[PDB]
Design an enzyme around this catalytic site. Structure first.
Site, short mmCIF file in Angstrom:
data_model
loop_
_atom_site.label_atom_id
_atom_site.label_comp_id
_atom_site.label_asym_id
_atom_site.label_seq_id
_atom_site.Cartn_x
_atom_site.Cartn_y
_atom_site.Cartn_z
N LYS B 162 -28.54 11.01 62.72
CA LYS B 162 -28.91 11.51 63.80
C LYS B 162 -30.39 11.90 63.35
O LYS B 162 -30.58 13.15 65.11
CB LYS B 162 -27.98 12.38 64.75
N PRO B 226 -12.50 15.83 56.62
CA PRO B 226 -14.00 14.80 56.78
C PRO B 226 -13.68 13.66 57.50
O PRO B 226 -12.95 13.34 57.97
CB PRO B 226 -14.19 14.42 55.29
N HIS B 232 -18.29 14.84 50.38
CA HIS B 232 -20.08 15.14 50.45
C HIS B 232 -20.26 16.47 51.26
O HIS B 232 -19.16 16.77 52.18
CB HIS B 232 -20.49 13.04 51.55
#
Ligand SMILES: C[n+]1cn([C@@H]2O[C@H](CSP(=O)(O)O[P@](=O)(S)OP(=O)(O)SC[C@H]3O[C@@H](n4cnc5c(=O)nc(N)[nH]c54)[C@H](O)[C@@H]3O)[C@@H](O)[C@H]2O)c2nc(N)[nH]c(=O)c21
Lengths: 300, 291
Positions: B162, B226, B232
């Site tokens: 995004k 997550p 990550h």
């Protein structure tokens, strides 16, 4: 008489401190009490913020004949200007008068920088600096002494050491639970921030957590798992206070770089008595804040 | 000048944001047909605000305290504009696009994760093939900003989908580790400290080299829970209040590192707090277990 005046005579806009289109808020530096016409008025800060929508208010408006001005139209999508009735038009106005130079700096738009403060950095740098650069906590004392906002108190544990006062903040118009915001202020004086917390304060912290949540359930029918309960570091005022916010409210100051969950504060102190004296805390500062320069140069 | 329908029975609130002063409404019209009405308060215009405040506006004092006071301001019609978006007739796909469920807070102990959460995760088909494609350079290889190719301590830094990278205001990159099998914070031990330190230091340096943005402009953190169970780390511009950066979900990478240094069993033993959607079956499983 209906109190319908700002706490000063006349308002002159000196400069815009900060505005946000996405947040629908604007911070204004004003000059006031200039009837003599010498351009030498006192400082004031005025904060204006649009209010959230009320579900059943807008529902009743849409089922009638709203006043609309067409902007764009294409197939099934269209955009309008809506001028709603008086009920949906109120603007939350917060005034600081007289405003200090510290007030002008905290509300002036500035880029933020992150810093990690060790326990040594706090004692040698931060604590000596903040003692002269802190805002007055007289408003805190006024609430505790029942000199101001006594009728707004939702709950109070009156104990001088382990007690506190639960009260709405400045903004929550209390018209919907979606933006619920309350603060709990401890009666015990001299607890500046997380850095002063020891296992001696565990009874107080547990009281704020459990009695505060129960009071919100009693008064607002708001379950505990709907709440985000935390503290600020750095705090805005150096008298210990806890923030009770609706979980669905994206409240400012709830980011990870400032907010510390009260339940984890308690559990940290239980696991390590010197946790908040020795551990490193991460927070954000204005780029031109002299405290940031002092911490950066000591860290070299 | 009127709505393209008659009547409006509110079926449900699709989503709301008190912070953004916006609301998304699903209504039944012509009673019924489906319609989506979005209402948003408008930003302030400095000239309109200045003209109003300099000339005796209509105010009602709520309360005062020392130098602080709050009022209700009733501005003229010129400042009450409400941006109104209508989708009519609205489809089921429109409703799915806007709908959001309420959030509920839950605290998951170390035993809760092993006994409740992990068996629930294993019972689901959670594909992270798109993660493997990035690591194996079979997809999105042209988007990689930086890579430490080490199979145990390395990672790939990639911008968020995004983020169009046309400005630094909403800078958002993700560091995906090369090592496999690290579901989340719950699997972290001091043996991952070289990996975590590499992500922190090499990640910040790569962002400085590529975007000319040094480390103190950045918020570096992990999510719990997550969105996908392959370790990550999120790199976001500090001025960007990115979704998921709230205290109820974000964990600063520096604190994760120092927690493992202070206690090797930290993330296997400590209680973690996070939000779940009200209709998430994991929420009911945790509530029944904690009863
Ligand atoms: C002086 N005072 C303080 N508070 C509250 O105590 C807390 C102070 S610390 P916080 O970090 O939350 O914000 P801050 O602006 S430094 O508080 P403040 O004293 O300067 S008043 C400004 C208000 O404006 C809000 N704000 C600030 N920045 C933004 C922003 O960027 N976007 C939005 N939408 N809102 C923002 C704050 O949440 C705050 O409520 C706030 O919750 C205050 O509302 C009090 N409450 C009682 N009852 N009475 C008091 O006199 C009193």
């Amino acid at each position: 008489s209906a109190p319908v005046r700002l706490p000063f005579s006349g308002f002159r806009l000196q400069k815009v401190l900060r505005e946000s289109a996405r947040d629908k808020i604007i911070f204004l530096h004003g000059k006031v009490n200039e009837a003599s016409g010498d351009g030498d008025g006192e400082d004031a800060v005025v904060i204006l913020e649009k209010t959230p929508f009320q579900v059943e208010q807008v529902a009743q408006l849409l089922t009638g004949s709203p006043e609309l001005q067409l902007q764009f139209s294409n197939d099934i999508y269209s955009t309008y200007h809506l001028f709603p009735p008086r009920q949906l038009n109120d603007v939350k106005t917060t005034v600081v008068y007289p405003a200090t130079e510290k007030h002008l700096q905290k509300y002036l738009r500035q880029d933020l920088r992150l810093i990690r403060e060790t326990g040594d950095d706090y004692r040698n740098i931060t604590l000596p600096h903040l003692e002269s650069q802190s805002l007055s906590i007289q408003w805190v004392y006024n609430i505790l002494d029942k000199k101001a906002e006594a009728d707004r108190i939702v709950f109070e544990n009156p104990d001088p050491s382990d007690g506190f006062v639960l009260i709405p903040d400045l903004k929550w118009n209390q018209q919907q639970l979606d933006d619920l915001y309350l603060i709990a202020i401890c009666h015990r004086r001299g607890i500046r921030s997380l850095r002063d917390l020891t296992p001696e304060h565990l009874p107080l912290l547990r009281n704020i957590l459990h009695q505060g949540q129960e009071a919100i359930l009693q008064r607002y029918r708001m379950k505990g798992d709907h709440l985000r309960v935390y503290l600020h570091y750095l705090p805005s005022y150096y008298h210990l206070h806890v923030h009770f916010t609706a979980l669905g409210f994206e409240a400012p100051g709830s980011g990870v770089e400032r907010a510390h969950l009260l339940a984890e504060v308690i559990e940290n102190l239980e696991c390590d008595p010197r946790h908040y004296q020795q551990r490193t805390l991460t927070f954000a500062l204005r780029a031109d804040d002299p405290l940031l320069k002092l911490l950066q140069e000591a860290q070299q």
